[PDB]
């Protein structure tokens, strides 16, 4: 099973809705004012789904706790590709400026 | 309970039910990540931005977003000897098999 169940709570994709203006960050940045980050949640359940695409050692990890929950814990759900987004700031000459900011946004989730 | 860390993790091949297929190592030492993400992140963890504004809005409101999570960030490989389906000796290096960091994602 290494390479060379509660569906409702399988790990997934939800929405986290980041608001600037509720960190204290609008009178810095101007754009956009809330975005669509999203977050990874859910259970690694054994047998791990193709698209979970774990690594061989939560392969292991998820088996070895599946066979004894008290000693091994399971792997978890995590962003495994992140996007960027483009944020707008006012510049030193006072004209609006956009700026690519990376690992902002989860484009897949999966078990590690 | 404790910061975010690597810890020990003994894996047993015939435990698993894999001594079927592989010939050796029956056993090997994998490691596992487990424990807390918050403030402050320590240099170690290396946040990527999308896990710092996470754990930001798990601190503003952590009944409403939670929390990142400890898992590994970099991994090595081990060479495993087994033996296939048409009975033949194969020998091949696996990835990704031994936790050397963890981290907050």
Redesign the interface.
Known sequence: ????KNLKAECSRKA?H?NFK??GWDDWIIAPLEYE?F?C?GLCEFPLRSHLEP???AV??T??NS?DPES??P?????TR?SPISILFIDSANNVVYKQ??????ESCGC?
Not at 101 to 106: I, N, S, T
Request: glycine share 0%.
């Open positions: 099973p290494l390479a060379t986290l980041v509720d960190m980050a977050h949640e690594t061989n050692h292991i990890q088996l070895m066979m091994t814990p792997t978890c759900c995590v962003p992140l900011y990376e690992d902002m946004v989860v590690r």
